[PDB]
Design a protein around this ligand. Structure first.
Ligand SMILES: CC(C)[C@H](C(=O)O)[C@@H](O)C(=O)O
Ligand SMILES: CC(C)[C@H](C(=O)O)[C@@H](O)C(=O)O
Ligand SMILES: [Cl-]
Ligand SMILES: [Cl-]
Ligand SMILES: [Mg+2]
Ligand SMILES: [Mg+2]
Lengths: 369, 368
C-alpha cells in the first residue's frame, strides 16, 4: 500500500486472544489522543486473528485478514493463543498458524525487541540487587524469516525405531547481510556496540553468519563488534547485562536471547516487539502473550500494547514526534507511580491501577503536551 | 573393553591451562579413596587439546584415542586457549577433541548436575529472595544426535546466494534412550522431568515430545511437563526451585545447562558426565581451561574432584567411594575452605590455594 501525502494512514488492528482486546482498547485510546494532538488522519480496520479467527472462520489466519494487512501501512497486533486451541493440530494452532505465515508472507525478516530496566523498577528484575542497580538497555535484533524455522528438508520418515524427523537450518549471505545492517545501524544510534550470538564452533550456518557479520562490520567503523556463543551468551546476560548494547542473532538464537532479556527486566508488561520488512511495513505487538487467566478482568498491563503503537508510529509511519509523545507519557505514568498489579507487591494489590486507569492517565498525559 | 574382576583402568586427559593443576588434586583425592576402600586402579596419562598440538601436532593423537578405548572411563580436564584459537577450526582443541570423542564413543548421554551449595546461595546472580530458597537441577542433554552430528552440513553457491546449511535429525531410538535416563534420574530425585523443546517450530521437537510421552507411561510416578526453549530460559530465572530434571536435545541442552550453571554463581564446583549405553564415560569440569590463572595455584579443584566422584559412581559402580568424595568436598566448603573466586576480593587472605583444597579434601576422606 503506498501512502500519499495528506491521505489517511491505514492501520490493520489484529487484537487476537486473551488480554489482546482489552489492552488494544487502551492503545486506541492513547492513539485517539495523539491523533487529536499532533494533527493526524489515521483509519483503523479490525480483523480477526489467532483463536478468535479459529472461532469465527475456522483458521488462525483467514484470507480476509491477510488481505486486510496487505491494504494497510502497518499492523497493530495484540496477542494470540490459549488453552482453548492447544489441543489442535500444529499448523492449526493460533501462534504457529498466524505468526509464521504473517512473517513469511510479508517478508518480515527484521525483529527488534527493545528492553531496559526503567528508573525505579530495577527491583522487580530477578537479578541480584547489585547487578540490577547497574541498569541495562539491550536491543535484540533477530532474523525472523530464515534459519531453521523455514528451512527444508523438514519432516519425518522411516520406520520402526529408526523413524526419524529432521529440520534444516539455512542462511545465505543476503539474509545475514540485511539483518546485520539493521543491528549496526541501530548500534550507531545507541551505544555503538553489536554482540553477534552464534554457535560457530559447531554449525556451518554460524561460521557463515560470523563471516558475513564481519563483512558488514567494515561499513560501521564507529561500532564495536564482538561475537559470543549462544550457550555463553545465556550466562553473560546474567552476569553483566549492563555491558551489552545491540544483540544480533539468528532466528532460533534470537527467540531465546530476547526471552531471557525480557525476563531479566522483571517487567515484561512494558515490552514491545517490531517485525518489519525492507519497505518499512511491519507488525507491532507486545512481547508478552495473551494471558488468558486474567482476560477480561481489567488488570492486564496495557503499556506493552501502547508502546507497540508508539513503535508503529516511529518505524512504519515515520511520525516521529507522535511516537516520542507516547513514550514520554508512558514514562511519566510509571514515575508518577501509576503501576498495574504485577509491578507491585502482593500486599499493595489495592493501590494497583486497572487496565483502563492506566490508559486514561497516559491518554491525559498526551493531551497535556 | 569391559571390566572383568581385575584392576580398573582410568585414562587421564588433563588438557590445557588449569587442567594439570586441578587434575593433580583429583589424583590426590583418588589415592586417598583407593587406600580407604582398598581399590585396585591403574592409570594411564595422555596428551589432549593444545598440549597435544604442541607435543604431537594434533588435538586428539591416535595414542590418546586408543588409550581411552582401553579404559573403563576417562578423567578429563579442559582444553582450549588463545595460543590455538587462530588455527583452522578442525585443528583447535575443543572442536578437535570433544566432538570426535563423543562421536567415537557413542556418548549419547550428557548429565550436568547443578545446585546451590549450603552457604553459597548468595553467589547466584539471582535476587536474594529467589536464591536463598536453593535449587538443584540435573540437566540430561542428548549428546550425539540432533544438529551437532546431523547431515548434511556445509555450503552451496557463490556471492549473495553463497549459503550454508545444517541438519537437525532425531530417530525414535535416539529420543527413547536419552528420555529413559531422565526418567530414571527423576525417580531417584524429586520425580519431575521437564522436557525442553520447540515443538511449535521444529519437526524434530514434535517427534521428541511424542517419544517422551511414550516413555513417560513407563514411569507413572514421575511428573512430566513440556516447556518451549525460549520460555524455559525465562522460567529458570524466576523459579529455579521448581525444576528437578531437565530433558533436552543436543543444542537445547548445551544452552539450558550453561544458563543453570551461571544461576549457581559457583561454576568451579560443577562437573559433567558424558556416557554411552555400556557405562563407559568421560567425566570433566563444566568450566574451561582458564589460561590466565594457569600455574598460579588459585584454580578451584572441586569440579575436577567431583568429576572423579561421578566417574566412580557411574562407570565403576563404586557408590561408597563416590559418596565419600562428595562428603569430603561438602565438609571443605562448610569449614571455610574456599578458593579465590568464592570470596570477596577483600577477604582474599582467607582463600585457599588449589593444593590446600586437595590436601584438605584428601585428608578428610582419610578419616572414615
Ligand atoms: C510462537 C512461536 C512460533 C514464536 C517464535 O518461535 O518465533 C514465539 O516464541 C515468538 O518468539 O514470537
Ligand atoms: C565446545 C563446544 C563444541 C561444546 C558443545 O557445544 O557441546 C561446549 O559448549 C560444551 O557445552 O561442551
Ligand atoms: Cl535459526
Ligand atoms: Cl540438536
Ligand atoms: Mg519466542
Ligand atoms: Mg556449551
Amino acid at each position: 500500500h503506498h501512502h500519499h501525502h495528506g491521505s489517511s494512514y491505514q492501520i490493520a488492528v489484529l487484537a487476537g486472544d486473551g488480554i489482546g482486546p482489552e489492552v488494544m482498547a487502551e492503545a486506541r485510546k492513547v492513539l485517539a489522543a495523539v491523533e487529536k494532538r499532533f494533527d493526524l488522519s489515521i483509519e483503523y480496520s479490525e480483523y480477526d486473528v489467532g483463536g478468535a479467527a479459529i472461532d469465527n472462520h475456522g483458521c488462525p489466519l483467514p484470507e480476509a485478514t491477510l488481505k486486510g494487512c496487505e491494504a494497510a501501512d502497518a499492523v497493530l497486533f495484540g496477542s494470540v493463543g490459549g488453552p482453548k486451541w492447544e489441543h489442535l493440530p500444529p499448523n492449526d494452532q493460533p501462534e504457529r498458524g498466524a505468526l509464521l505465515p504473517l512473517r513469511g508472507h510479508f517478508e518480515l525478516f527484521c525483529n527488534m525487541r527493545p528492553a531496559k530496566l526503567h528508573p525505579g523498577l530495577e527491583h522487580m528484575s530477578p537479578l541480584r540487587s547489585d547487578i540490577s542497580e547497574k541498569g541495562f538497555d539491550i536491543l535484540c535484533v533477530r532474523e525472523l524469516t530464515g534459519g531453521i524455522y523455514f528451512g527444508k528438508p523438514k519432516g519425518r520418515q522411516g520406520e520402526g525405531e529408526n523413524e526419524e524427523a529432521f529440520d534444516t537450518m539455512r542462511y545465505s549471505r543476503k539474509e545475514i547481510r540485511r539483518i546485520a545492517k539493521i543491528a549496526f545501524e541501530s548500534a550507531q544510534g545507541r551505544r555503538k556496540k553489536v554482540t553477534s550470538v552464534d554457535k560457530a564452533n559447531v554449525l556451518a550456518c554460524s561460521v557463515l553468519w560470523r563471516e558475513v557479520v564481519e563483512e558488514v562490520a567494515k561499513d560501521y567503523p564507529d561500532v564495536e563488534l564482538e561475537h559470543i556463543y549462544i550457550d555463553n551468551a545465556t550466562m553473560q546476560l546474567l552476569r553483566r547485562p549492563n555491558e551489552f548494547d545491540v544483540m544480533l542473532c539468528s532466528n532460533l538464537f534470537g527467540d531465546i536471547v530476547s526471552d531471557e532479556i525480557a525476563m531479566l527486566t522483571g517487567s515484561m508488561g512494558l515490552l514491545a516487539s517490531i517485525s518489519m520488512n525492507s519497505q518499512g511495513f511491519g507488525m507491532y505487538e507486545p512481547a508478552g502473550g495473551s494471558a488468558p487467566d486474567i482476560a477480561g478482568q481489567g488488570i492486564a498491563n496495557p503499556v506493552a500494547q501502547i508502546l507497540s503503537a508508539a513503535l508503529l508510529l516511529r518505524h512504519s509511519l515515520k511520525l516521529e514526534d507522535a511516537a516520542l509523545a507516547i513514550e514520554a507519557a508512558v514514562s511519566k505514568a510509571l514515575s508518577d507511580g501509576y503501576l498495574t498489579c504485577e509491578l507491585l507487591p502482593a500486599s499493595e494489590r489495592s493501590q494497583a491501577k486497572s487496565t483502563s486507569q492506566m490508559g486514561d492517565y497516559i491518554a491525559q498525559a498526551i493531551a497535556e503536551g
